């Protein structure tokens, strides 16, 4: 926390940074170092909140010749509370923000710490969007590196399928554009190696049209649990790109569209869209609404930046965390039971057991594409415990890691962004032997010294 | 737009400064000069995308010595054009959209280039925010230094009610902060007094805390336009502060929500919410929903950075615009026939007649508090004519006109930020002359040689 470093080497740094240094003395040090998951408690010896590349290229530079231990920071979701260290250098990205979008070329090239929020502001100003996650205050950054999915990504792909290059600087503190032709080894890896090559700075991304989008939400009793999964599950198979529809089992919200006697039960909040045109979506999303009797429905045509925005809403931000999350090739009846049992236990208005149905334009893309695992696997379960007070941490994760061994024969794999602090040793399997391996190879050669290990991380071979 | 440039001068500025130049040669050029109102087609000498305050000193200084005609550019919703200049320099913030929000201290630090979706995503990762404009690719910049005002308004005030310092940079090249204890007098100005002062490279905002909005629209046939427009407007007169109330007067959109017999016809679109507990707002929301006969409801309960994404779902995204606007103190029963007469002659998709209700915390505030002018006339109407095909300009800007004129007789003031190329005449009406003569001070004291004109300009 409050280590020696030398003298000159801190001087050199201070005279090349034009950004904000926080130290462990100054006020505005205990807020800087929370990051979204708030079990994380870490106190590094100094954040240094970069405003440019050359910025960044300091940072690296003054952390290597230095020893401190890495930490990056783009918008601080990490479910495994990577983007905050103990006693070392955080290069904190948040205050570079800027999107420049160009409605011609259709395209954006988004600083690293941009938010998603700010992001699909400024393609929305041009009716432009590509896919990212669907919570506005999700940094980009971490989410594009591990793959990135949401409301666009059946129609879309991941928004690594949609990036085209970006510029990054590595441990060497050399600063790189990695595309299709230019370091190709090093672009196939950050496409869901995540932090474990260098800091991004600079994403590009090509982007889509997209209007108006017909939303339902509603909610469903517990009780008809097993007709509406498998209603879900049946029609996700074959259904057009352009609907997507996600289930997210949790206590129902005290809000007025629902019945007060429904308040504070397990339901299942069905949640759902149709990219492409309204009066499509409202024929599709209401032959889906009656998967069982739908309570506190509400339909509504939205700008995309709105559907964006739209996740969660409840009147407290949850301070705890913790997630286990796998994929699914299958969604057996079994299966679903186990879901239903694990749900019914749920004990905090803010915990949510999610299945999301994947596939489309994401399980289009070869295997071999990006290093992002796992494409044809089309489902997602994720045990997303969250809470408030400290005195529960525990009870709050042993449900999480019950449902998850109870469901574990039916997993495989799993998604780097929602790995949690004590699931290191998921990688490998994670990202399986062949992509790991040549994951491990380009770590070689860009990072042989693993001076980004803050991640979901790849020693080098 | 090929200016000769004094060599020691540009080579100065280029040492100093650290963003993007953009040139007339450059690839870029033409996409980076057009602002949102697309009438406006001009050609700077050079376009400055500042990413820093010395960025900014830089920029005005080398404008200042080379006489460069100086627009500012935050988010480009100059209504007036003002974001864009022939011949001059563009200090264009578009890149300086960072946002620090701590929520200890329910207090976020904006950068001048930042866009209102951006500062709303920041602050509600804390279930935080303050009144801004309701859609959300506008400047936070040009917005906030007229006024501003949004669905949070009535509640919380104008976003200068809710700003508590600035950092600005002068005509003189000097970086100064302004609040109620520091250059008082350009604190009072620049909340209201627009661009005319200096740069503003950060605003400093209280926040408040702000949990999901039940929130409704609903569409009414024109034809019910006098007991829609007489229900609203009595309405408002004793509406508690948490109720935000406007309707547009427009072409239906063709949306699955309204029956495809209503597309394209006349009608009310009436936006509401209830800022407070969502119970409430079902109860509030419903006793208003019958005005007169409700089709194409949507209710939503919505966190509030959704609500501001909200406005509005169309498909397409317009060129072309040309806007009249005026206070009302009083809406009586003949300025309503007056609108709803010109309202009916909106014969194409994108423009809208409307009418906002503001008052609540607004009108709180004591008149000679800020440069904001007009916070006791409770309605705004705005004549916001949009359209695309460049042929259509003479035909649409008349109807916007003779809207105006025939409700000449019920207007007063103005908001600076809703004046359209032509206004500059309109300044000394809008602020009054008790403002307009303070104002005109503390311009000579800050920027007397008028560098900063391309706004809606107080002449030292
Ligand atoms: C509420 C919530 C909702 C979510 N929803 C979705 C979703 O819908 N879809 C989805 O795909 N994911 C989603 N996620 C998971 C999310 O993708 C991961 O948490 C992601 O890692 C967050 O990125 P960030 O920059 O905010 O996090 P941080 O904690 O700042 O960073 C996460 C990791 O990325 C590294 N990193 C961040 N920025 C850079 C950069 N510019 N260069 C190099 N390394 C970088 C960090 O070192 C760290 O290892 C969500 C997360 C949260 C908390
Ligand atoms: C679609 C649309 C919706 C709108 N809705 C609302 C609303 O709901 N409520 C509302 O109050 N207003 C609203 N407005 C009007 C808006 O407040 C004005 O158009 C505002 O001037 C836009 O700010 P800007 O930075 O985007 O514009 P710009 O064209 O970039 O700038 C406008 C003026 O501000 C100056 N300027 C901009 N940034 C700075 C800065 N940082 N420092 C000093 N000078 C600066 C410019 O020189 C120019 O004179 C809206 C505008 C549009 C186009």
């Not at 600063?175 to 299709?180: E, G, H, I, N, R």
């Not at 129902?252 to 069905?270: F, N, R, S, T």
């Not at 992002?372 to 007070?389: C, E, I």
């Not at 001076?451 to 790849?458: G, K």
Request: hydrophobic share 40%.
């Amino acid at each position: 926390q409050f280590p020696q470093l030398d003298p000159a080497t801190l001087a050199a740094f201070s005279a090349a940074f034009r950004g904000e240094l926080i130290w462990p003395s100054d006020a505005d040090y205990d807020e800087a170092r929370r990051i979204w998951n708030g079990t994380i408690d870490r106190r590094p010896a100094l954040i240094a909140r970069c405003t440019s590349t050359p910025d960044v290229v300091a940072a690296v530079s003054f952390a290597r010749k230095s020893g401190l231990l890495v930490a990056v920071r783009g918008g601080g979701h990490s479910m495994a509370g990577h983007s905050v260290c103990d006693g070392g250098i955080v290069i904190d990205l948040s205050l570079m923000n800027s999107i420049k979008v160009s409605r011609r070329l259709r395209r954006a090239r988004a600083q690293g710490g941009c938010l998603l929020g700010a992001f699909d502001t400024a393609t929305q100003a041009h009716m432009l969007a590509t896919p990212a996650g669907v919570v506005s205050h999700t940094g980009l950054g971490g989410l594009v590196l591990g793959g990135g999915f949401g409301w666009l990504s059946r129609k879309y792909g991941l928004s690594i399928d949609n990036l085209t290059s970006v510029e990054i600087v590595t441990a060497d503190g050399g600063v790189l554009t990695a595309s299709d032709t230019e370091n190709p080894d090093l672009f196939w890896a950050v496409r869901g190696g995540g932090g474990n090559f260098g800091v991004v700075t600079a994403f590009e991304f090509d982007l889509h049209r997209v209007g108006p989008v017909r939303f339902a939400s509603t909610y469903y009793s517990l009780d008809e649990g097993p007709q509406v999964i498998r209603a879900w599950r049946d029609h996700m198979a074959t259904a057009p790109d352009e609907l997507t529809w996600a289930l997210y089992l949790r206590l129902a919200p005290p809000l007025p569209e629902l019945p007060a006697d429904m308040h504070g039960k397990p339901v299942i909040c069905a949640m759902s869209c149709w990219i492409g045109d309204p009066h499509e979506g409202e024929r599709q999303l209401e032959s889906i609404l009656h998967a069982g009797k739908p309570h506190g429905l509400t339909k509504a045509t939205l700008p995309y930046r709105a559907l964006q925005a739209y996740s969660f809403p409840g009147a407290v931000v949850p301070d705890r965390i913790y997630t286990k999350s796998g994929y699914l090739n299958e969604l057996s009846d079994e299966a679903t039971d186990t879901v239903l049992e694990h749900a019914a236990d749920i004990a905090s208005p803010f915990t949510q057991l999610e299945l999301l149905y994947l596939g489309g334009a994401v399980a289009r893309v070869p295997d071999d594409a990006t290093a992002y695992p796992n494409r044809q696997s089309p489902f997602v379960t994720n045990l997303a415990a969250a809470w408030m007070d400290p005195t529960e941490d525990a009870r709050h994760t042993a449900w999480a890691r019950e449902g998850y061994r109870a469901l574990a024969g039916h997993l495989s794999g799993g998604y780097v962004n929602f790995m949690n602090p004590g699931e290191a040793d998921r990688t490998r399997e994670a990202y399986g032997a062949a992509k790991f391996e040549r994951l491990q190879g380009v770590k070689a050669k860009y990072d042989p010294t693993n001076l980004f290990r803050l991640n979901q991380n790849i020693p080098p071979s």
